[PDB]
């Protein structure tokens, strides 16, 4: 349910729901990026 996006301009942690427009809540920039996943990221060092 709670989804976080990162604004492309001001780099703000943005809690928004679904079906509401992609709109930064304090600078109005309309491009946001997903945060890095919380799953296990393991690489061999080759």
């Amino acid at each position: 349910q709670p989804m976080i996006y990162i604004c492309g301009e001001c780099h703000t942690e943005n809690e928004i729901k679904s079906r509401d427009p992609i709109r930064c809540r304090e600078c109005g920039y309309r491009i946001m990026y997903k945060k890095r996943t919380k799953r296990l990221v393991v690489f061999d060092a080759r």
């Binding site: 989804m3 679904s18 992609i22 990026y33 945060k35 996943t37 799953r39």
Partner: protein
């Protein structure tokens, strides 16, 4: 940039042997290729007829390692309504046999998630116009033969005020057998085989070639600029400078480069005594070897 079909080399190098026009092409600042120690030799017959033998130990150290970027875009539309959501078998029709749990609650995959072919990255459901299934699956998957890591997910509005997402997938490309490599003289060729450092031939100083090209690639092609660039690269790497290969320059000829190379304790024509990597016996013919600029195609 969420460019479709982007390729980036890990360790691009400016050429040791350059023309003076490359200062204005800005090739020094955005180079495409690596200066590689290259012997022109017939070794085990795996470089025959426009093929090369790559050093596996060099490739393990990041030699010509590149990263491939592919961007996937998808819109949700209101006509029939499409929505970015994670599909569920109890309420969606046409779902493939893919791991839909890689998607988040917004129907989109997160950066850092490993993906394979026919893996959903954007979950899209379109409502049926008219029971067991009320929504139809219209999700987007990767290409069937493509894997990688999700690099970046960008979500925005499009021109018509609809939700718009772009997903960049990061794929690390190790140089392998069949990858196409070219010199700066029209001498293209796939990789025939990769030998480790102990299998490669070596000079008396322990230098093994990064790439071995066939001698038969030269004479019918008459790419003498390849050999002169190799000689000048040897002189430049030993001297500690960048060699000038502007074409119509009378201050640079083969004899001057040869005398400069002879000043650094090498044979003036760029030949070296190589030893067999398998038996240790030195090769009867002395092999032309030096640094020359290859590009990963």
């Amino acid at each position: 940039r969420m460019d479709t079909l982007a390729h980036v080399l890990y360790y691009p190098q400016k050429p040791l042997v350059t023309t003076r026009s490359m200062e204005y092409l800005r090739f020094r600042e955005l180079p495409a290729g690596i200066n590689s120690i290259v012997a022109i030799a017939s070794y085990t017959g795996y470089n025959q007829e426009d093929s090369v033998i790559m050093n596996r130990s060099a490739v393990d150290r990041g030699f010509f390692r590149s990263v491939f970027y592919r961007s996937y875009k998808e819109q949700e539309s209101k006509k029939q309504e499409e929505v970015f959501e994670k599909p569920t078998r109890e309420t969606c029709q046409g779902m493939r046999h893919a791991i839909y749990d890689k998607l988040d609650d917004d129907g989109l995959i997160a950066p850092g998630v490993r993906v394979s072919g026919d893996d959903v990255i954007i979950g899209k459901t379109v409502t049926l116009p008219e029971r067991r299934y009320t929504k139809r699956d219209c999700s987007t998957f990767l290409r069937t033969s493509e894997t990688g890591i999700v690099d970046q997910v960008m979500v925005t509005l499009n021109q018509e005020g609809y939700k718009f997402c772009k997903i960049r997938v990061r794929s690390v490309r190790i140089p392998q057998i069949g990858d196409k490599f070219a010199s700066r003289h029209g001498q293209k060729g796939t990789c025939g085989i990769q030998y480790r450092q102990e299998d490669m031939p070596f000079t008396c100083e322990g230098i093994t070639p990064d790439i071995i090209i066939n001698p038969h690639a030269i004479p019918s092609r008459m790419t003498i600029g390849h050999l002169i660039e190799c000689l000048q690269g040897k002189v430049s790497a030993n001297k500690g400078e960048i060699g000038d290969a502007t074409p119509f320059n009378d201050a640079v000829n083969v004899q001057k480069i040869s005398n400069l190379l002879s000043d650094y304790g090498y044979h003036l024509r760029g030949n070296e005594v190589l030893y067999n990597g398998f038996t240790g016996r030195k090769i009867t013919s002395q092999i032309f070897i030096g640094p020359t600029y290859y590009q990963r195609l």
